[PDB]
Amino acid sequence: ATKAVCVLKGDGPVQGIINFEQKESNGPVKVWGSIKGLTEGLHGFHVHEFGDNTAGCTSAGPHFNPLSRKHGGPKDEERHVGDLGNVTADKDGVADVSIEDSVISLSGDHCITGRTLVVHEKADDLGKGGNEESTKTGNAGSRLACGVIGIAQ
Amino acid sequence: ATKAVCVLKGDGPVQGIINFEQKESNGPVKVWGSIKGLTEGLHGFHVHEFGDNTAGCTSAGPHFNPLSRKHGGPKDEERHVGDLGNVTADKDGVADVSIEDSVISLSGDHCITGRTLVVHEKADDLGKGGNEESTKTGNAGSRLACGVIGIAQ
Numbered sequence A, B: 001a002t003k004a005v006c007v008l009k010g011d012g013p014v015q016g017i018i019n020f021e022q023k024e025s026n027g028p029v030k031v032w033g034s035i036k037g038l039t040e041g042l043h044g045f046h047v048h049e050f051g052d053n054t055a056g057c058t059s060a061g062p063h064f065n066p067l068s069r070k071h072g073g074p075k076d077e078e079r080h081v082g083d084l085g086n087v088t089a090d091k092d093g094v095a096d097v098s099i100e101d102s103v104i105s106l107s108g109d110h111c112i113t114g115r116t117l118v119v120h121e122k123a124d125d126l127g128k129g130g131n132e133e134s135t136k137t138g139n140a141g142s143r144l145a146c147g148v149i150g151i152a153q
């Protein structure tokens, strides 16, 4: 298998740890971990293009989009490679994450390693919000925490 | 050109920013930036194998060594791919870095993107210290600051 990992930090209380594992080349990637310090509800969760956090999470640029598509949800055909939807926090501010995604990869042109995982301020509307920004960012707002996705042992 | 970047942080006062640029595929890589908060003297400077900072800089593992060689300096034929020698701080605590290396790459099997850059506690002896550890780590001590090397715009 191929493995990757991301430590999420920002300027506020949000922080987390997310693991990625891919059994086979071109097969699905399991994504799991925990994020804390959140407000209750949905927070957009995306791989952004650049693994640059020079100036904070803003430096990571737009959602990772090697296939030239519009923004969507992870269950949509029309989506960015980096569109992993939302994580959902309870009242305690914790999101336990355990999903599988077929579009991200840990090798090749869909590879997310060396890019930035970001957890956002607000819900991602998954492109269904009825404005142009919806089909670009999902209207998920600012970047609460992020980290560069790295190769794991 | 291909570009990458790394934000160095840790538990202490050391922090920095390092840029990488590779003009031609498989060509030399320019490495430049600044590290502050260092004690006066040499600090070992390496790409480590993993981009895992789960538990801090320790999680990055040994030096990036795809060819299973012994530790050396950047000028040596016998070196780890990640062996970038030392950065050198004055009394101001600053090392202003400007290196070119032809062994590291931002593509291929020697790609450093997705791995961890680390600045160490003390001098790297470039494998000339006369003990087994010299030939593994350069006796450069603990990990003051690190970050995952990411794809840049």
Ligand SMILES: CN1CCCN(c2ncnc3ccccc23)CC1
Binding pocket: A021, A030, A031, A032, A098
């Ligand atoms: C509760 N935990 C302990 C075992 C580590 N965990 C996993 N390990 C390996 N692969 C996974 C794939 C999908 C979801 C979780 C895991 C689960 C976290």
Ligand SMILES: CN1CCCN(c2ncnc3ccccc23)CC1
Binding pocket: B021, B030, B032, B098
């Ligand atoms: C457009 N680019 C990134 C920053 C500017 N560039 C540099 N390249 C290489 N070394 C440097 C050392 C100090 C300051 C700037 C650079 C040229 C490539």
Ligand SMILES: [Cu+2]
Binding pocket: A044, A045, A046, A048, A063, A118, A120, A137, A140
């Ligand atoms: Cu996003």
Ligand SMILES: [Cu+2]
Binding pocket: B044, B045, B046, B047, B048, B063, B118, B119, B120
């Ligand atoms: Cu090192």
Ligand SMILES: [Zn+2]
Binding pocket: A046, A063, A070, A071, A072, A079, A080, A082, A083, A136, A137, A138
């Ligand atoms: Zn998107």
Ligand SMILES: [Zn+2]
Binding pocket: B046, B063, B070, B071, B072, B079, B080, B082, B083, B136, B137, B138
């Ligand atoms: Zn080494």
